[PDB]
Design a protein around this ligand. Structure first.
Ligand SMILES: C[C@H]1C(=O)N(Cc2cccc3ccccc23)C[C@@H]2N(C(=O)NCc3ccc(F)cc3)CCC(=O)N21
Ligand SMILES: C[C@H]1C(=O)N(Cc2cccc3ccccc23)C[C@@H]2N(C(=O)NCc3ccc(F)cc3)CCC(=O)N21
Ligand SMILES: C[C@H]1C(=O)N(Cc2cccc3ccccc23)C[C@@H]2N(C(=O)NCc3ccc(F)cc3)CCC(=O)N21
Ligand SMILES: C[C@H]1C(=O)N(Cc2cccc3ccccc23)C[C@@H]2N(C(=O)NCc3ccc(F)cc3)CCC(=O)N21
Ligand SMILES: C[C@H]1C(=O)N(Cc2cccc3ccccc23)C[C@@H]2N(C(=O)NCc3ccc(F)cc3)CCC(=O)N21
Ligand SMILES: C[C@H]1C(=O)N(Cc2cccc3ccccc23)C[C@@H]2N(C(=O)NCc3ccc(F)cc3)CCC(=O)N21
Ligand SMILES: C[C@H]1C(=O)N(Cc2cccc3ccccc23)C[C@@H]2N(C(=O)NCc3ccc(F)cc3)CCC(=O)N21
Ligand SMILES: C[C@H]1C(=O)N(Cc2cccc3ccccc23)C[C@@H]2N(C(=O)NCc3ccc(F)cc3)CCC(=O)N21
Lengths: 177, 179, 179, 179, 179, 179, 179, 179, 178
């Protein structure tokens, strides 16, 4: 409905990540984070996440912009945070990462593709393995789990309840009503 | 869509939210935003969620469900036309005593739908996840209807069409709004 | 669509709602919102529902039907061009004495259409549901026309085209609006 | 489409309605709304319906036709470019003495087109309906042109192209507007 | 298709003709050629027409029908699997006393299907032709079954599925071939 | 297609030619070759041209027509199933007294179909050519049926469906072959 | 497909018939022809029907079923790879004591699949027909397995995968052929 | 492609069967027929199954596997190019001591692949079935290789590419055939 | 294709045509022809004529191993083009009996492929195609006399050779002059 509803929530420092993460969505979220820091460098931002994931580089545009700005960015999972979505949920300010009780969190390894000559396939494989090491290291730091446990637990699609995500260290609290 | 504000925005000003389509992430994110906005405008006055939906994404439905239970205002639910699948789940999720259907509205309940492709172990993970999702939906529907988990399981095995009056007998709504 | 307000929004200001397309959930949700808005503006003055529609979704049609019967104002119905299937059902649903057609407007009645694919038991569920839907439509049409259920069943077995005058003799409308 | 209001909205302010496309339900609903609005603004002053149309839906055309005959103002018709099929029917439907074409405008008359698929009895129902529709169009064209039903039937058997002057001799218009 | 001659050619040597597909002109021309060839080989010995067909072209079916009635040998008909529409017509066309179905074979009768597009008068010609075709099929079915034309008309209004035993009671076949 | 020689080659050995498909250049060239071959085998014995065809190319049809009239043997024609358009023209082209239809065979006559695209003068050339083609077909049909050119023109204006008996009354065939 | 005769034709010479694909009318007509041919060669010696099939048309399957029961020789059935749906029905239809599966072969039973679109009464006819077809399949499966109709109904409600040993315990086969 | 009998048929005369494609029902039915034919020609002499296959249908693979174990002759297996998935399963299924690979041939083992769409309970049935299929494949591979079920499970979790020499160390073959 | 068809008449003289892209179907046909010719006569030369843009590496290795396996020498003759696995099979003919006609083209390059899915699936596919390349390069080294390092460098991109250059490289033994 139409300020449109999202613009009115942005006035209260609420950003919606409510779709697949591509470059357009990431550029919108980065712009909103930068704008909110300029409006007030001290007050919390609320990043609400309902996303099946998407582009790793687009996800890292959002991740780095969160860590760059001065305000704490709270994260709240509603519905689902899968893949890069769950990475960004875990990237919220320490003590301010939440999920609502019936929200789902899914973690897994990065997906990609490579076509062409053996040496091109080698370059693409080395790059996606380095990307996975980078994602896993940051998830280790943000969850408190070892790199070896994160590697094993992301080998395949791993679905967590809100409560299990909290036990894992992906969030700090389940927001009960 | 006519203007007075477009018609939906004018109804939102009176705390009326329309769920009038298939439930996907875009629709859920719109409904969640409207619920949060209405709570900020007035944390005490009732909200009116009108439902004409064939259902859709279970996770999108749960974004709406958890946002309803999270906010302070009671959310009334009114079924007009049809509430099927996740649509009927959200109809049942309205504030106790304030779940309604108009007399010719249809309610349909059934088990979740999905897909799985790839290696045996990937199919196993997808099967375990959709069975756990069904247990979660059935448990909440049990709490909101007063029916046993075993009855909900049996009654959702296939497409199960209810009249407004049958939805009330089932405990999915509290009253049929007669004219 | 020209401006004066777009033309439809200007008509809505005079309590005129246009049903001028196929009936789907989006069209029904727009019409329901307009009916609720007009009731809130004035609970006593007539509303004018103008119908040029080939029909569409039965559940979407029932969202409109139940909203008409729910609100306090009389809803006049006027058929201009064509009212077929759920369109003719909604024409017959207007306030008693205030259902009209212009002289060359066409009214068509027929049984509901649908589909079913899959297992024998899924086809059985879909068949039972569409037969119950037809019984529901025929019962209400009987009440609104004064015709017996048996006559409506026979007369809707196939596409049945009526002139405005025949629709009036049938009891689908009260008057032909002559110039 | 330029601005001064878009150009069509500025013409509507001077009681000029453009029928400049294929006739479907959307176009008919727009024209009907404009006729009703112009009658509400002034029930006495002429309306100008300018026609450049290859025709289209018969029922949509009849929505326009009946709305013209219903309202109190005279509706002048002016053919610019082409009036074919239902377009030429609506050209002939203007107020007596106020139906015009510009000198190089084309008018085409022909019988209605359709289709029918399915069982023998469904094909029979569709054939009876389109023949009754043709009888209805031909009867009204007879009344508005002064030609006999037999002549209209023969002259519409195939595509029949008329000059502005021939349309006037036929009684489809009253005058060729000379510069 | 195996070899021994392909299997169908070996059966043709024993005066067995297979109608095992949809009836089109190619299938009909093959069957007509086989009937003529078998009559030339021996004008006295029975021919065996085995039918597993969902039907198809009425004119192609009548090529087969008239060729059966034309030649001197009796043509036995045996339904194996299904004889629907023109397939069931040809099953009923076998020599009196020599029309069979195996116990689980299905017979379906219904009215002819077709289509028509274009001008009202083209649709009228197509409708008249398919109604005359239906009268022709029903008259011959009346003669071959012993049922009245009125009963055949009513019983073919919609898809009518018969067991082998019901086909025999109806007079479409003379006997169920039991093992 | 079964073997005994394939079935068509065995019938050709008895001077039977099948025209059992749409007439295109390939079908015409096959039929012309068969007529020439049969004349070379025996210049005195009758040939039997069996026709089940919806028609097709006029020039391909005239390849067959002129080859029939050119060779010394009489060519009998037998309509089985349907002879439409150029098919019915070739049925009428059989030796006088030896043109037959089976009782339930259908005959259809109508004017030629075609197309034209491009400049006005190209469309004029294509229109003149198809009108001259129609004059040529109607003149020959007049000679073969005994009907006047004026009657053939009127009767072929639209699709005209004939029974075997009506085809005989028209002079398209000499006899209905009764069983 | 190699030569020695193609390999299938060489096996047919030893009274071995391959059902190694989806069951459609073409496959059924081939199998029916092979059964009839083998009975004519020797009315006493066993026939070997080897089955690796995901199923297919129920009427095509019944053409095969009835032809098996009709002929005098015992037809052994051997499941190699998979017998699903109509495939498992035909496996169960082999001569008593001569129905086999190899140890790793899979048998799957489930209810028939179909579809229906159109008017409520057409959907009702299609639903009644597929339910009657399922009763017919279940009755015969009851007779051939020794299981009750009610047990077969419950066990075929969804896809039910059996090992060779489970198929034997069920009564679908008599023995697992061990090496 | 080449003739001498096609080249494959000439090799079959020397008891050589070539599996050079994806394993589907058609390929499996051809291989099963060739194995049965060769056993009938000589129940004692070795058969040579040469394998270059990326795998395919598990049930089709098991048709071949069970037919190999059923017949009396030893079936040697020789991998040339690649044996992946069901291809490598069949390579391992050759007579003990007579399973070979040429030095540059690749062997790949991995878990079965599939898919499932629909209701939670349908996905559960499909998941249980593919997990049971994997247990069956792994048990037989354990028996034929000498590896534990737990090692086979771990080693097939993902695509596992082996050289000829590694396949021999694993127990999938007995020897690398050096030139 | 004229009439035995012409290819079957050449097969009667122990001539096999590899005249298309190499896939499993073509490899299975060539393997069958090699086995058939060995059964007809285990001593006389076979003539494998190659006009092929290459194709599947595993299909190519089915042909390669079948050539080395059978007892007869298999001569190779390049007519038109031998690219990729085509040029690998040209180099695989019996020592001293690998030929090209003077205007025939030979092209060598590294293997092509693809990989989709999880990081670990991409890793498995990359390791496999790199091992396949090491295997091709090692065999080409043995058959040409060039070092593995030179073959690696020379196959990094599409490398087009004349018949004479293919002979200097050791991919063939002689240019068949008229
Ligand atoms: C910090 C510095 C800078 O490096 N950038 C680059 C930049 C560009 C786009 C996205 C970024 C995301 C993360 C980090 C840097 C990004 C822009 C920024 N500016 C502001 O932040 N200006 C307040 C502002 C932001 C948004 C807005 F809408 C209004 C004002 C203008 C003045 C300036 O020096 N800077
Ligand atoms: C409750 C708390 C919080 O955790 N969030 C996070 C959040 C973010 C996105 C979606 C959510 C959905 C459900 C529950 C929390 C969600 C936002 C909220 N805020 C407000 O509600 N602010 C008034 C407001 C809302 C909307 C509007 F338009 C204007 C004002 C900002 C102040 C604050 O502490 N909170
Ligand atoms: C005559 C009567 C009525 O039956 N209708 C229904 C109607 C709807 C659509 C098209 C129609 C065409 C022909 C005839 C009736 C049509 C609307 C009309 N109204 C007006 O004309 N109101 C001034 C008005 C109209 C439009 C506008 F933009 C402003 C004012 C509202 C008051 C009222 O009683 N009526
Ligand atoms: C009757 C009751 C209620 O159950 N609903 C639910 C409802 C929601 C959506 C569609 C419906 C359709 C038919 C029937 C109920 C529908 C809304 C209504 N409200 C109003 O009608 N409010 C005036 C209003 C409407 C529109 C507008 F722009 C301004 C005010 C808010 C206060 C309230 O208690 N109610
Ligand atoms: C009865 C008469 C005739 O009108 N025809 C025309 C005809 C043609 C095609 C299909 C037809 C189908 C139904 C009825 C007539 C058909 C052919 C027939 N002939 C034979 O039957 N000849 C023995 C014969 C038949 C088939 C065969 F393979 C060998 C010989 C040639 C001699 C002859 O006078 N006649
Ligand atoms: C009549 C004359 C002639 O002008 N032609 C040309 C011709 C060619 C192609 C199609 C034609 C169609 C219609 C009319 C002429 C056609 C061929 C014919 N010939 C024969 O008929 N030869 C016996 C023959 C024919 C066919 C066959 F299979 C065996 C012998 C060669 C001897 C000869 O003088 N003639
Ligand atoms: C063992 C028994 C049997 O159960 N079958 C069924 C069967 C059918 C299809 C595939 C099968 C695969 C594996 C096992 C059984 C298979 C066929 C077999 N027969 C032969 O093997 N006959 C020699 C033969 C075969 C083919 C051929 F061309 C010539 C001779 C016919 C005589 C007989 O009793 N049997
Ligand atoms: C029993 C009777 C009959 O009703 N038919 C019809 C029929 C046709 C096709 C499949 C059928 C399957 C089951 C039952 C009837 C079937 C054909 C059969 N005939 C034979 O079986 N003939 C020996 C034969 C068969 C095949 C073959 F290649 C050679 C000879 C011709 C002689 C005869 O009276 N009959």
């Amino acid at each position: 409905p139409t300020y449109d509803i999202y613009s009115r929530l942005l006035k209260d420092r609420i950003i919606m990540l409510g779709s697949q993460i591509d470059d357009n969505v990431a550029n919108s979220i980065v712009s909103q984070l930068l704008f909110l820091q300029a409006q007030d460098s001290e007050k919390d931002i609320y990043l609400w996440i309902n996303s099946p994931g998407g582009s790793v580089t687009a996800g890292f545009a959002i991740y780095d912009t969160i860590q760059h700005i001065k305000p704490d960015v709270q994260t709240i999972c509603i519905g689902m945070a899968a893949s890069m979505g769950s990475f960004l949920l875990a990237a919220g300010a320490k003590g301010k990462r939440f999920a609502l009780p019936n929200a789902e969190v899914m973690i897994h390894q990065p997906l990609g593709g490579a076509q062409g000559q053996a040496t091109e396939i080698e370059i693409a494989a080395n790059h996606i393995l380095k990307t996975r090491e980078k994602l896993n290291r940051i998830l280790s730091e943000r969850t408190g789990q070892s790199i070896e446990k994160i590697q094993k637990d992301t080998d395949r699609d791993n679905f967590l309840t809100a409560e299990e995500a909290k036990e894992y260290g992906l969030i700090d609290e389940v927001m009960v009503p």
